[PDB]
Design a protein around this ligand. Structure first.
Ligand code: X3W
Length: 900
């Protein structure tokens, strides 16, 4: 047991709460999750010891590869006849003397071939399966047989015109360093009648007894508002209790609902709230799953602790809110009573559902012309015309925020069998289902059961708040299991972690998929841990995320120990910054720095703040902290500028110092999402041969309004440039930094990165640009920082241009010409914008879905589908492609007072 106790201390330190608190949770769902999730843990551990040591090395150091080995024409043209120059370093003599070997090989060469060529060059100077290639300066390895150019490091080197520097390491040098972890099963591994829902011939009714902890200001009259929901879709009309004074919240009233108990869908929920009053106002709210995790209908007495109303929610009910009782018991508590049927009621099995769907399909197949004429949801098989097929195809092209009329819904449902031939229509077909009809739902189940697979980015939509059904969500997860690459999983990890909150139960297919991937890929596992840990202060998700983190920490292996180093380093940094903002806030920079350096030099702190992996990128080792290079930044919330040595043997070939900005006080979640979207945008542009280089620098939220920002070396704000001022200062600075022949490359890089940031900021509705949030690298790469604001943040009770190209920017674009607006350079720059704008337009659904998946997150500027609709306005989705280009030009023309 000594091993178990110690490991529980390690897991508790990682999660930020003791494991014993989980053991005390009475709720059977919680204890069943803890026990049953362990098979995902076992499965993942089995996959890792399948082909050991190689399979273990693949888990710890997965290949950091692109999704496809194909190169866009513009990237291939950067290669000398499809060949790349590569530098291979062999550490040999004592005191680690470095021998370099320059190779000109095909871009498609496998690491083993690269090693053979290196051995050839070293032998000419006077086995291949005994070495591995490592990226110089960081812990990135090439353990798998992918073409060299498919490795992200290599592709980046090709794209940026950089020399790839790789190090020949012995297989045994790496293998001996990966410890053998023996995953142990925890102590908790060792643990009337029953009627079907469809045999309950009764209407729904729920009793509202009384409310406790209704502490309000003498508010002069209150009631309970209730409704039956399927996602955010009401299943019947809302039912309110009679009004009562808040001084005595007693109702003892059965509420009768307009729904037959057998018609209740699987994901049906009771959404309620205590309202005051005419200006009706919600005081507290709470949601409940009408069926528990065991598929049992709610029976008996239940007490539900309510949640405080979130600012901006005028609506009396909160359906897209969290389901379950508030963990804090010193909150308004509502007592409810459910119906009793003298037996346990369960949701029918798939076999019963299938028998019923086949019975319905067969019955409908025999319907006469006139019977089918009774309903617009009924359509005879052979009546399917080509015009109808064309209408179905047109509907499937519409964006997820485009309204589907009641007529289109009846249309889609009656043609559901033809819909299988155009499988991407599934999200529209599902919103057209009468979720309060068991006859229709049973048939939808069977259609989904055998539904053709759709793209992972299309399936992701089916995991958002509009799709609560577990059969639907199960199909989505299966598409991800079959077609989502680890690369794309990493890219969309924030969205996939968010959509976990929309799950009715702790144990589901999505969490099993995500956990298995985190436990079989340490790069995925790293960010999985941090995304969950960053939200552990949020009581809406702390039990879910806490239980998930416990399962992750039991099976991740040795990485727990490394994570605990990063957790301890962040904890010390939160502690220091918290003191500086509450105890030393008014003191000078010189004084504050003296306190900081004295605190940091304490042996306990000094050890905790050095020799750990960067949470921004775990391939980066943070060695000794360079205190003399550290500083308190004069910016808002006084962030810490931190500098560590990169202890890697060949750090000089990557970077010798790792500089990170630690910030305590601002919410960094909107920045992370924007930075992710900028990268996705750049990826779309690059694939279409549209070379607009963006700078989606690293940003990670590690807690409540705490996080890390990746520093971009040799980059300066426009204000830093002009504060050496004329409009020619910037262009003169770039000319000075790019003297000679290389000048044109800087102007091209500037105009290209400028076009990208113009289009990206206009689409996304980012916070207003100024000379302190626009940065420029010495080579001419323009980029933006501080993405705290996006979408419709300047809304009133209509669209903006956040990046207005002042004379300074146009002078650079036009190479110093006076009439910068009327030059061929500016005409070429406009063309880059138009193409960039239209390309994003073609991928609008992806962007709409990425934002829709982030709705359950507590982001201030992303609270409703109305906020996402801003992107539907900027992309001009209701207009044609030419009208959309015209609208963009007009927005640009108005903001710049001419030119477009
Ligand atoms: C104060 C800080 C938190 C700001 C505000 O919100 C951001 O997003 N910020 C940010 C991002 N980046 C940098 N600031 C940054 C700052 C300075 C430097 N540089 C590098 C050279 C010296 C220093 C400078 N220009 O002062 C480089 C940076 O990288 C881009 C990411």
């Amino acid at each position: 047991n000594r091993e178990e106790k110690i490991l529980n201390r390690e897991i508790g330190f990682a999660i930020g709460m003791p494991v014993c608190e989980f053991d005390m949770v009475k709720d059977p769902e919680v204890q069943d999750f803890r026990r049953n999730i362990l098979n995902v843990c076992k499965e993942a551990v089995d996959l890792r010891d399948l082909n050991s040591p190689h399979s273990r090395a693949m888990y710890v150091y997965p290949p950091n590869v692109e999704s496809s080995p194909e190169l866009p024409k513009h990237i291939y043209n950067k290669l000398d006849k499809g060949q790349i120059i590569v530098v291979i370093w062999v550490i040999v003599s004592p005191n680690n003397d470095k021998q370099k070997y320059t190779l000109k090989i095909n871009h498609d060469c496998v690491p083993e071939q690269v090693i053979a060529e290196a051995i050839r060059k070293k032998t000419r100077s006077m086995y291949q399966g005994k070495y591995i290639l490592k990226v110089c300066g960081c812990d990135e390895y090439f353990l798998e047989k992918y073409p060299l150019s498919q490795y992200k490091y290599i592709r980046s080197c090709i794209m940026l015109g950089r020399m790839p520097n790789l190090m020949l390491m012995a297989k045994e040098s790496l293998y001996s360093q990966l410890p053998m972890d023996c995953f142990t099963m925890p102590s908790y591994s060792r643990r009337t009648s029953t009627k079907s829902l469809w045999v309950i011939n009764s209407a729904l009714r729920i009793k509202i007894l009384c409310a406790t902890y209704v502490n309000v200001n003498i508010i002069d009259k209150i009631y309970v508002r209730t409704g039956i929901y399927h996602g955010g879709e009401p299943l019947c009309d809302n039912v309110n209790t009679q009004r009562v004074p808040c001084s005595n919240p007693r109702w003892n009233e059965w509420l009768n609902y307009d729904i037959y108990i057998p018609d209740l869908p699987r994901a049906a929920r009771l959404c309620l709230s205590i309202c005051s009053v005419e200006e009706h106002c919600p005081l507290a709210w709470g949601n409940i799953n009408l069926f528990d995790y065991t598929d049992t209908l709610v029976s008996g007495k239940m007490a539900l602790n309510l949640w405080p109303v979130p600012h901006g929610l005028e609506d009396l009910l909160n359906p897209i809110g969290v389901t379950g009782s508030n963990p804090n018991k010193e909150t308004p508590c509502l007592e409810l009573e459910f119906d009793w049927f003298s037996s346990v009621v369960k949701f029918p099995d798939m076999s019963v559902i299938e028998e019923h769907a086949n019975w319905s399909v067969s019955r409908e197949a025999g319907f006469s012309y006139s019977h089918a004429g009774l309903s617009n949801r009924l359509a005879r098989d052979n009546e399917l015309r080509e015009n109808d097929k064309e209408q179905l195809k047109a509907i499937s092209t519409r964006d997820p925020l485009s309204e589907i009329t009641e007529q289109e819904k009846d249309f889609l449902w009656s043609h559901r069998h033809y819909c299988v031939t155009i499988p991407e229509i599934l999200p529209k077909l599902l919103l057209s289902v009468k979720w309060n009809s068991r006859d229709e739902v049973a048939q939808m189940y069977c259609l989904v059961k055998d539904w053709p697979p759709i793209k992972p980015e299309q399936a992701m939509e089916l995991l958002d708040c509009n799709y609560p059904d577990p059969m639907v969500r199960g199909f989505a997860v299966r598409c991800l299991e079959k077609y989502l690459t680890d690369d794309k999983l990493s890219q969309y990890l924030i969205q996939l972690v968010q959509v976990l909150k929309y799950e009715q139960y702790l144990d589901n297919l999505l969490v099993r998929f995500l956990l298995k991937k985190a436990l079989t890929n340490q790069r995925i596992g790293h960010f999985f841990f941090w995304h969950l840990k960053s939200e552990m202060h949020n009581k809406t998700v702390s039990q879910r995320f806490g239980l998930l983190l416990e399962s992750y920490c039991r099976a991740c292996g040795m990485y727990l120990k490394h994570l605990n180093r990063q957790v301890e380093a962040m904890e010390k940094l939160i502690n220091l910054t918290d003191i500086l903002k509450q105890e030393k806030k008014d003191e000078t920079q010189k004084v504050q720095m003296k306190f900081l350096v004295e605190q940091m030099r304490r042996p306990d702190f000094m050890d905790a703040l050095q020799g750990f992996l960067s949470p921004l990128n775990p391939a980066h080792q943070l060695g000794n902290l360079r205190l003399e290079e550290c500083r308190i930044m004069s910016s808002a919330k006084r962030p810490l500028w931190l500098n560590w040595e990169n202890p890697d043997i060949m750090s000089e070939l990557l970077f010798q110092n790792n500089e990170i900005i630690f910030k305590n006080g601002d919410d960094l979640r909107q920045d992370m999402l924007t930075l992710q979207i900028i990268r996705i945008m750049e990826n779309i542009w690059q694939n279409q041969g549209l070379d607009l280089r963006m700078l989606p620098y690293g940003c990670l939220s590690i807690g409540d309004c705490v996080g890390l920002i990746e520093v971009v070396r040799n980059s300066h704000t426009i204000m830093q440039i002009q504060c050496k001022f004329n409009s020619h200062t910037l262009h003169q600075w770039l000319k000075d930094k790019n003297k000679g022949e290389i000048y044109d490359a800087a102007i091209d890089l500037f105009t290209r990165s400028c076009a990208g940031y113009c289009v990206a900021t206009f689409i996304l509705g980012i916070g207003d640009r100024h000379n302190s949030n626009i940065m420029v690298k010495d080579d001419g790469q323009l980029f933006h920082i501080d993405f705290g604001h996006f979408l419709d943040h300047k809304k009133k009770k209509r669209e903006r241009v956040p990046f207005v190209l002042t004379q300074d920017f146009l002078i650079v674009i036009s190479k110093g010409a006076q009439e910068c607006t009327k030059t061929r350079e500016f005409e070429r720059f406009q063309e880059m914008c138009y193409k960039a704008y239209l390309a994003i337009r073609q991928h609008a659904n992806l962007f709409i879905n990425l934002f829709s998946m982030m709705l359950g997150s507590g982001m201030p500027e992303l609270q409703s589908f109305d906020d996402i609709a801003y992107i539907r306005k900027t992309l001009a989705l209701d207009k044609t492609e030419q009208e959309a280009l015209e609208y963009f030009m007009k927005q640009m023309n108005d903001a710049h007072h001419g030119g477009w």
